[PDB]
Write a protein that binds this ligand. Structure first.
Ligand SMILES: Nc1ncnc2[nH]cnc12
Ligand SMILES: Nc1ncnc2[nH]cnc12
Ligand SMILES: Nc1ncnc2[nH]cnc12
Lengths: 284, 284, 284
């Protein structure tokens, strides 16, 4: 009744999308806030508002942009989510999962994701990038995993294994490209902690995450990764570090969304170029 | 309106059960998947589908077996749940609690529980058993405890103490019987971490649970233990170890439900015999 | 439809309150159970049952007292919540937040909060007080933060920073007053862990909280602190220690609500006097 992310409902959305554009995409992309410039450069693009697509989640309470964009990047066919859905806004498990399962039915085999996040590991500075190699899902441990509910068997198994959720060869490709352009000094690898949000982590929470072996903390990405891994889509996820929360606690410095967006502004053009090349070089 | 697990609603279920069978059970049992063979050996048994019992939770979305079975084991009178309710399927706190409170009103004084779980402690191997001596309830710490909601005063207190939830004399009895049959080399004791599920723990989550002093991790049992302790029912809970998740992470080996069920097949007959004897020897 | 804690709904409640009493309060207070004697000493007081105020949450399932009390303490104008709302009772994020946002619209600039809690740090004894200097919010990390949902922009920002949620000058004032009355030997400072509840922490959970750097654990206060910090209200929060859970685990001693209330009885008159003086000395 609130629309389950099942096979029938995802197929109705895919059918509408397929007859309004001619694109069969191979690659899906979800971009962090302030990091979406690539979506404006999509060639021969079709913009489809969420509100026009059967069974897509209602987003008018939050407002702001919400479109699916289809077209070509680097000669590859892609579908993009413009205006991300975050669980701290109150969206349900079924609302998060439906767009990813629609990507699957359209033919997406690889999903590329970027986000903004806080740095925990003392090696991370403002403006650095982290290739995510694993995660700690505090909502999942505490009975709010994105897959709680009946399993949708056509998409995947009841009990997924997440050992390979972050594709190893895609991490090596993203690192190689940073080396060819001489910005590998900005690129780290690390473990991502999912904090449901929307408050930033307190100083004592940051210090707990350091003891637990977390390198980065943020409020997104893990739900989409789990839905993708469930249905067999490979994932690359990159965090842009806004601040080092441990260092900020030692110096009594606050974090705010204005400072976050300025960091996004500083790195946006480098990230757009990086991901355009990753898309171009991605293995068939 | 979704049916609260209160005194009136539990009594209507108990009244139907009492007039369809003649069994006043003293012992309740909840068996892990693939571990239910004992329930087929119940003597002079009465099988009651959940769907026939007033106020029992609806389970048709998930499908598969769901019956209450009453009868005799080892000369003792028992009630069994055949087809367990798990919180990762989306059942509410009230749906989990009602069958246990029905057991209470029928006269159950001891609840025996088995499950499948992942090994964290490096001493545990595939096929070992763990007598649970305590737990870490990540859903409870994070506002999804099975008792969140109004308290049902006829069953127990607002703020239960869980210091004695896992009965010490029942652990010693289960260990004694393993010694008399010379399989005590398979039996450990340990602390159980509740992961809401349904994804298996990621490698970085497993390594966090090791740092936190957890010996075993699984997706069930803690909700039923808490409802039982609330209303004064003594508990014995045993985990069958499917794999050692820490060792699997070091060697890059995946876990899947097929491997889990094969372990259950390998130990099912030993576990049935063990629990039949525990039931026989249980103190009045 | 379950009544959102938005600007329009909070203003209707404030408007009713404002025309039934003549008090424009500067200070809000929320008192722990057994710790409410100060509210009976409020001078020229007006008692307003929650059930009479537009948009206030329904509390008849739990029963027991629920009033807002307005009047004067130490020459200062205050509003008190008599009968606290706890999230383990099943109240929603919107029900917790609405009374605090009503306090804001009435003119409250400082919120004083007391609670009962378990001691983790080995320096804490039954009957001690802890000035809270920071927190670890396990519900917030696990997608049950009090602010999950649409943001109410008139009250505060989408992503609050909690670095200064516990006002430093108010902690120094409360400590100074304990020194002037020679009971500073009872007063500590510490980090508070929020356990959703309503079961007390198990022995293995207590030992985990010790490893994570928590000094005290309880079932309240963090939700109200976060709503207050969101809308710019300064906070002082004090825990009264009922028992030391680590020492109790080593000696196999149970905790129960009866023992908790006896500790509250033993300290109630000292706490009332302390807070009356804090209220008197609070900076304009
Ligand atoms: N410190 C931080 N900076 C940016 N995004 C975040 N998400 C969570 N914590 C964050
Ligand atoms: N590794 C594992 N094996 C079996 N059951 C589990 N439940 C949670 N983790 C598990
Ligand atoms: N041990 C304890 N004593 C009193 N209140 C508590 N709240 C949580 N744990 C507590």
């Amino acid at each position: 009744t609130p629309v389950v992310a099942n096979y029938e409902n995802a197929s109705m959305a895919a059918d509408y999308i397929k007859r309004v554009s001619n694109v069969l995409p191979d690659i899906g992309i979800i971009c962090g806030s302030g990091l979406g410039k690539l979506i404006e450069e999509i060639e021969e693009r079709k913009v489809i508002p969420y509100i026009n697509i059967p069974n897509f989640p209602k987003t008018t309470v939050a407002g702001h942009v919400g479109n699916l964009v289809l077209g070509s990047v680097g000669g590859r066919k892609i579908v993009a989510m413009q205006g991300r859905l975050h669980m701290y806004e109150g969206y349900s498990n079924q609302e998060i999962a439906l767009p990813i399962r629609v990507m699957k039915l359209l033919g997406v085999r690889v999903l590329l994701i970027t986000n903004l996040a806080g740095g925990i590991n003392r090696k991370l500075k403002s403006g650095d990038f982290v290739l995510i190699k694993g995660h700690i899902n505090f909502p999942g441990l505490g009975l709010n995993n994105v897959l709680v509910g009946p399993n949708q068997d056509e998409f995947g198994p009841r009990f997924p294994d997440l050992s390979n959720a972050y594709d190893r060869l895609l991490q090596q490709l993203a690192l190689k490209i940073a080396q060819e352009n001489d910005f590998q000094d900005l690129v780290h690898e690390g473990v991502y902690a999912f904090n449901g949000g929307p408050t930033y982590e307190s100083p004592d929470e940051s210090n707990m995450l350091l003891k637990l072996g977390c390198d980065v903390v943020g409020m997104s990405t893990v739900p989409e990764v789990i839905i993708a891994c469930h249905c067999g889509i490979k994932v690359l996820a990159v965090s842009l570090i806004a601040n080092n929360s441990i260092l900020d606690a030692e110096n009594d410095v606050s974090i705010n969304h204005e400072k976050v967006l300025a960091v996004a502004e500083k790195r946006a053009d480098l990230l757009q170029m990086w991901f355009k090349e990753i898309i171009t070089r991605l293995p068939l």
